Structures are given as C-alpha cells and as structure tokens.
Amino acid sequence: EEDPFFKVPVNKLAAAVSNFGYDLYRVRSSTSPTTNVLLSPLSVATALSALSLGAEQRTESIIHRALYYDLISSPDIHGTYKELLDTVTAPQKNLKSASRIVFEKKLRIKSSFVAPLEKSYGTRPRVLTGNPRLDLQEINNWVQAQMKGKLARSTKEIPDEISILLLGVAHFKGQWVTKFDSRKTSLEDFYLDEERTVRVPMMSDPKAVLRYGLDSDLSCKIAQLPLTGSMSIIFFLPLKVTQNLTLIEESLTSEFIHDIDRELKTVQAVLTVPKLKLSYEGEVTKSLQEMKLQSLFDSPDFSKITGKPIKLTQVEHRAGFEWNEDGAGTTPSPGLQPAHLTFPLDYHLNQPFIFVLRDTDTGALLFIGKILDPRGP
Ligand SMILES: [Zn+2]
C-alpha cells in the first residue's frame, strides 16, 4: 500500500526536503521570467533544518511543515538528515554542499544547541564581530574551504542589521557515464525564443543511449542521462520554442519526478547538449517569506539557542554548476542478438529547458536549473 522506496527513512526525508526545494524553485522562477534560475535548495533546507534545532515547539513546527516533515514519523529525523548528507556529499557524488548559521555580534549561544548541531549537521555557529570587512573575509574563507575554492568570492557587504543569517552554498561538476566526443562539439544555434537565436558551444552524440519519454499533457519531451557516482540528470524540453515553462514547473515534485524516472524507456537518439558553466549569488529571503515562513522574520522563539530574542533576517544562496564533455568511458558496445528494427529519435537541447540533478539511491534533488540561456547571466 506504500511504495517500498519511500518507506526507507532516508528516501522519505530526501523526498520531503526536495519538495521544499521544488517549491523554492517555483517561487524563484516566477520572479525570474527572463533570467536563468540555478538552485541547489538542499543547502538552504539544511540551514533551516539545523536552525530548527534551536527553536521551540511553535517555530519548530512552522519550519518542519515548510520542509514537509509533517508527513514523517521518525524517532530521530536529524540522524536521518546526517545519513542523507553523508550519502549525497560523498566524494563520488562530486557535489559540495554546505550550510552555515551566522549570528549577531556578541550573542551567547547555549552549548545544548551547539552539540546536536555539530552532531547531525557537521557545522558550528559563527558569531559576527561587527567589522564588515573582516566578517565578509571570514565568510568568503569558509565558503572557499567548504567548496574547495570552486565558487567565486562575494563582494556584497554584510549588512549591519543582522540577527540570524542562513547561508547555503553548493557546487557541482560531474562526469557523464558516457563521455561526449570533444571533436563533435561545435558552435550551433540556440533559440532563446521564437524571434532570437544565438551561437553556443554544443556537445553532440549522434548515437546516444538515454532514457526517454514524451509527455503530451505538459507538451514536452523528457530525457535522462546518467552520471558517475549513481546520479542522473533529467531534462524537460518543450516541443515548441518558448520561455514559458510554467506548466512543467507546476508538476515538479519528488513523487512526480520519481514517477517520470520510473516510466522512461531506453532509446537511441541524436543528442545535442550545450556545455554549461553557471554561477549564482543571491538572496532568497523574500521567496521564503512567501513560503509560509514569515513567522521566522517577526518574533520567533529560538530560546533553545539563546535567551536574547533573535530572528531570521537574511538567507543567502551561492551556487555553481558545470558540465562539459568529460565522461568515464565510451559506449559499452555489448554483444546483441540481430534485430531488423530501429526507432530513431532527436533530442536537441537548443532551446530553453529545465534540468534536474538527482541522487539515484535516495532520489534527493541536488541541483535544479531553468536554462533560458546556456551562456550564463
Ligand atoms: Zn531488416
């Protein structure tokens, strides 16, 4: 009566926080109609889950409902969270993801909050000093350490009015299971919309083995390419050239993506994929204020952290994402029984598309992009 996959606690928690991530993606995309969207919401959800350790029942419950924990009956959801983080940030996954809680200067933190925070989330609080330049330098150094320097350093100054600041950072550069032949990469058309076309570097595999399916309701075609480390990327490509992907965005949930994944079928296709090297640095404070989290910014109860009243004032996100032709090996070339019939398909990502990076074992959303322009911001 229940999908055995989502009965596994880590998989259920992955589904919950990834549903938070798809919600956040929808909010950001609705406010970015003409710009790329690039998010790794797991880091933001992790910052929020960690902060909930320091919250009393009311605020804790608000946070937990935003993270879809209300559908989970677990003895220790924070231990499950530690398991999930250890699984999806292992070396093979090529994903760096880090979360930080930053407190106003001179705040006195209870050790009873520091302890479970370190135990389950592997991070410790950072209390500001009041020197903007040194606080910015220290945050940049923390990001450099966590992301192996693969993210750009920030120049935005730390505001003076900060009670609680959450920081979520993520970087991904993966390796396809099946490399692209760099000799076939060339400049090709990318249709930004019905009336605009640009030239972008485009990787090509004319005989690509991928998992495919066409959704006529959403009027789009879906392809799945595996990556090393037991991950995959699922592309949603509209059938007509358009920047309007809202109907596709509305359907994205952990369970719906699991369904799509299960229903794709193996095929051979003429595949073109644009090279990607994207970055993002921004504030998601207002998006969260729109996501039933407003109470964190007025008068929440974080008395498990400190006796002085504190509140959320800022939530920052920095993300970097990259794929090129790099891959593990070439097509397997296995022995086959003779067959007469082929079923040719074309999958050309030469127009705005959405992509979702997912961990195969847990189903966790690790990265999501609306690519209106592969060249970047
Ligand atoms: Zn024949």
Author numbering: 42 to 418
The study reports:
However, PEDF lacks a consensus sequence for the serpin reactive center region and exhibits no antiprotease activity, while being a major neurotrophic factor in the retina that promotes neurogenesis and enhances the viability of photoreceptors, amacrine cells, and other neurons. Interestingly, PEDF belongs to the serpins (SERPINF1), a family of serine proteinase inhibitors other members of which have also been identified as zinc-binding proteins, suggesting that zinc coordination is a common property of this family and may affect ocular proteostasis. PEDF acts through the interaction with cell surface receptors, mainly PEDF-R, which contribute significantly to the survival of retinal cells. Biophysical and X-ray crystallographic studies show that PEDF coordinates zinc ions in five types of intermolecular high-affinity sites, leading to a decrease in negative surface charge and reversible oligomerization of the protein, thereby masking the target recognition sites responsible for its neurotrophic and antiangiogenic activities and collagen binding.
To identify all the zinc coordination sites, we next crystallized PEDF in the presence of this metal and collected X-ray diffraction data. Crystals were obtained in two space groups, P21212 and P212121, with one and five protein molecules in the asymmetric unit. In both cases, the crystals gave diffraction data up to ~2 Å. Zinc binding sites were identified in both space groups: 1 site for P21212 and 7 sites for P212121. Importantly, all identified sites were located at the intermolecular interfaces and included coordinators from two or three protein molecules confirming the role of zinc as a promoter of PEDF oligomerization observed in DLS studies. Two of the binging sites (#4 and #7) have lower occupancy, which might correlate with their affinity for zinc. In addition, collagen recognition may be affected by the occupancy of site #4, as in this case the dimerization interface prevents access to the collagen binding site. However, complete blockage of ECM attachment can be expected upon filling of type 2, 3 and 5 sites, as they contain Asp256 and Asp258, or Asp 300, which are directly involved in collagen binding. Considering the incomplete occupancy of binding sites in PEDF crystal, the described configuration of zinc binding is consistent with the average stoichiometry of 3–4 observed in biophysical studies.
